[PDB]
Each structure stands twice: as C-alpha cells, then as structure tokens.
Design an enzyme around this catalytic site. Structure first.
Site, PDB file in Angstrom:
ATOM      1  CG  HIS A  41      -0.546  -0.089   2.479  1.00 51.34           C
ATOM      2  ND1 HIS A  41      -0.374  -1.300   3.109  1.00 51.34           N
ATOM      3  CD2 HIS A  41      -0.212   0.858   3.390  1.00 51.34           C
ATOM      4  CE1 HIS A  41       0.061  -1.101   4.341  1.00 51.34           C
ATOM      5  NE2 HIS A  41       0.186   0.202   4.534  1.00 51.34           N
ATOM      6  CD  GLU A  72      -0.723  -4.716   1.763  1.00 58.70           C
ATOM      7  OE1 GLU A  72      -1.317  -5.273   0.814  1.00 58.70           O
ATOM      8  OE2 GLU A  72      -0.710  -3.480   1.920  1.00 58.70           O
ATOM      9  N   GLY A 146       0.893   5.494  10.374  1.00 65.91           N
ATOM     10  CA  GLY A 146       2.242   6.022  10.609  1.00 65.91           C
ATOM     11  C   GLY A 146       3.211   4.935  11.040  1.00 65.91           C
ATOM     12  CB  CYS A 148       2.467   0.857   7.178  1.00 65.00           C
ATOM     13  SG  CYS A 148       0.863   0.269   7.833  1.00 65.00           S
TER      14      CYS A 148
END
Ligand SMILES: *[C@@H](CC(=O)OCC)[C@H](C[C@@H]1CCNC1=O)NC(=O)[C@H](Cc1ccccc1)NC(=O)[C@H](CC(=O)OC(C)(C)C)NC(=O)OCc1ccccc1
Ligand SMILES: *[C@@H](CC(=O)OCC)[C@H](C[C@@H]1CCNC1=O)NC(=O)[C@H](Cc1ccccc1)NC(=O)[C@H](CC(=O)OC(C)(C)C)NC(=O)OCc1ccccc1
Lengths: 181, 181
Positions: A41, A72, A146, A148
């Site tokens: 992401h 991911e 904040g 990740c």
C-alpha cells in the site's frame, strides 16, 4: 527482551530509512545489495523520497503467493550506488512464532521508537483493507497509521514488516528468505 | 542498551499510567505510596483522568529550588487506595549523566514506545517555555508534543521526566530523591 531491543536498534541503524510516497510516510528496510521492502500500500511511484531525498525505483515487484493471494509487500530496487548490508541471513524460511518481539518504527511521526508487542503468533489468512491476505503475523498491540513499514524483530531474527491493524491488533507480513533471489 | 530497555519496560509496567488534564495527555510516574509526578505544565486540576478514570488530587506541589527557580515538576497525591510500588531507591541525589539512556512514553498518541536518546548530559539552566529553569538533562533527539511525562531511564536508574524540547533536543527535569519526603 533486552537482547531483542539491542538487535533492533542496531538493525534499524544499519538497514532502515524513512520513505515518503504519494500515499504516505513509511519505515523502509533495506535487505541486500540495492533491494529494499515496503508495505504494498505504499504504492511506491517511479521516484520515492528516502530520508528526504529523491531516489529512482529501477523495478517494483508487489508480492503474491502461488494462488495469486495478497502478501502485501512490495520489493524495490533503488537507483543508488550504496549497498545495503546483507540481512538475508536474518530472514526465516517460514513464519516465525515468538513469545517476545520488538516492532521498530522510523518516521517523522515516530522517529526511532521501539515497541514491545509481546507474543507474535502466526495468523495466516486475514481480510486486510478488504483484501484477502496470507502469511500474517499477529501481536496484541494498538497499532496506528504512521507505523506501516515498522520492522518486527526478536533477538537475531527479522520476522516481518508491519502492514495493518484493526485498532486492537497489528499484523506484519512475514519477511521470508525466499522472496529474495 | 539491552538492560536499560529491560529496566524501562518493567518500570513502566509497574509504575506508570496515562493521564489526561485540561492541558493535555501525559505519561505519569507513580513514585511511592500514593504520590505521582507530572511536568508542571500538565497544570493538573482538582481531578485528573488516569487510564481513563476520574481521580482526585488530595494535594499538588509544583516544585522550585531555593532561589525560587523553575524545576518544572508537579507532585500529586492521588485519592486512591492502591499504592505505588516504591521506586525512590531508583532516584539519584543529584543529576545523573549517562552515555546510553531510554525515554519511555505511555500515551494514546505514543502507547508503550521506547526511544534510545543516547547521551544525556547535565544541562542545568535553560530558558524553557520562556521560563528560566534549572536541573535540566539534555539528549539529542527530536522530541515532540505528546512526549511530556516521558520517563528517562538507564539500567537501574530513573533519571528525569521529559518536559520540553526545542525541535532538536529534549530536556528532562531531574527526578531527585530528596524531592520525595
Ligand atoms: C499503515 C499506513 C501508514 O503507516 O501511513 C503512512 C502515512 C497502516 C497501519 C494500520 C492502519 C490502522 N492501524 C494500523 O496499524 N495500514 C493501513 O492503513 C492498511 C492499508 C491497506 C491498503 C491496501 C491494502 C491493505 C491495507 N490498512 C489497514 O491496516 C486496515 C485499516 C482498516 O480498514 O481498519 C480500521 C479502520 C483500522 C478498523 N485494517 C484492516 O483492514 O483490519 C481488518 C478488518 C477491518 C474491518 C472489519 C474487519 C476486519
Ligand atoms: C510536552 C507537552 C505534551 O506532551 O502534550 C500533551 C498533549 C511538550 C514537549 C516538548 C514541546 C515540543 N517538543 C517537546 O519535546 N512540552 C512543552 O510543550 C513545554 C511546555 C511548557 C509549559 C510551561 C512551561 C514550560 C514549558 N514547552 C516546550 O518544550 C518549549 C516549546 C517551545 O516553545 O519551543 C518550540 C516552539 C518547540 C521551538 N520549548 C522551549 O521553550 O525550548 C527553548 C527555546 C525556545 C525558543 C527559543 C529559544 C529556546
């Protein structure tokens, strides 16, 4: 947890940086040679901001398993002449389950902060950001935006990259040795 | 820094809580019996919110030195029947100077986060929030709002409470043994 903290601080000093993409600011972990990882992401563009500096993205593999499922992670090869100290030896061949872990964050929001998240258990499948996702590791800690890219570690081990949270648990995607050629 | 982290995590588990006052949310350190400390600017009212719970303030001494100068600590006696494990034995008689320290934060903004701030040197006098202030300890770390009340530790030692920052350094007020009767 003392040695886990000591390992984390040295890892992050050696291999991590703060990345901004058009989708936000993340912690980034350099793996070997010129290849780093982010959560998928982060949607890294053709250029990223790395410690406030424009850097080109020579390639960017978003990762999935054999059944095309979401893992991911995005791997990025950076246009830079410095090489990442090689930490592949720290990456397990499969999902590690640990009793005491540290999650380490390096952003403007959370500069060099470390969190003992306690027990990490293998969680595998989760519906994340609405997307089905596997190879997830779970710890019971109130993680926020904040965080990740956060690197999840125990003594001698790089276990995963922080990628999500539901307000009560957080989830790292397992950083497996084989993802790295 | 491993043992410093291990000491910090256990201290904060044992003696700290999250306080909200009309002036904000802070980390709070319980010292002995029923007496806790905050930065003076927490300006604690007649009631505080402690881990989300209303608690009465039986007394509140803002502290100053002999020349009436600002030390930037408020001591509070809490209306509660539980007693704080006694950590006065961990408090120095004068300002401690350390080569490796951990700053530990416990808020909604920063829940159980720990920061290795490195070298703490005695700084003594500083013009803080415009107020002249003494017994300050300084570390080179980019501290922000939401970190006041942060507890600064090394192995076996509670050195000070985080009270300020200029965007580039942060400053703890020294938590001296004698402040506690
Ligand atoms: C990292 C982003 C970051 O650091 O910002 C850079 C500026 C962020 C961290 C987590 C979000 C909240 N807490 C966290 O620890 N991750 C995400 O935002 C991530 C984005 C994403 C994008 C694309 C694909 C997958 C994931 N999303 C999540 O973590 C989601 C957020 C969410 O929708 O849930 C809440 C609103 C927090 C409740 N989490 C999630 O999907 O949890 C499972 C779930 C959600 C709803 C119902 C059932 C189960
Ligand atoms: C803690 C408050 C908190 O956690 O919020 C709860 C919701 C906060 C933390 C520091 C502020 C910025 N970074 C920090 O680490 N402390 C303060 O806000 C504190 C308040 C205060 C109130 C009353 C008396 C004394 C202090 N103030 C400071 O830390 C000030 C802030 C400031 O004015 O400076 C900047 C705007 C950050 C530059 N810091 C300060 O006074 O530094 C010395 C200085 C300032 C200006 C010129 C020269 C020297």
């Amino acid at each position: 947890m003392g040695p886990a903290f000591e390992f984390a601080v040295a890892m992050m000093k050696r291999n991590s940086s703060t990345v901004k993409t058009e989708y936000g600011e993340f912690t980034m972990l350099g793996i070997y040679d010129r290849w780093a990882v982010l959560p998928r992401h982060a949607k890294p563009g053709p250029t990223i901001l790395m410690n406030d500096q424009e850097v080109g993205v020579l390639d960017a593999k978003e990762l999935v398993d054999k059944d095309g499922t979401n893992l991911e992670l995005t791997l990025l090869k950076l246009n830079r002449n410095e090489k990442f100290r090689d930490i592949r030896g720290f990456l397990a061949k499969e999902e590690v389950e640990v009793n005491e872990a540290v999650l380490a964050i390096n952003t403007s929001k959370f500069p060099n902060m470390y969190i003992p998240v306690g027990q990490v258990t293998e969680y595998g499948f989760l519906n994340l950001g609405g997307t089905p996702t596997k190879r997830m590791l779970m710890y019971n800690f109130p993680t926020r935006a904040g965080q990740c890219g956060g690197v999840l570690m125990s003594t001698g081990k790089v276990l995963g990259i922080h990628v999500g949270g539901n307000g009560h648990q957080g989830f790292s995607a397992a950083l497996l040795k084989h993802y790295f050629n």
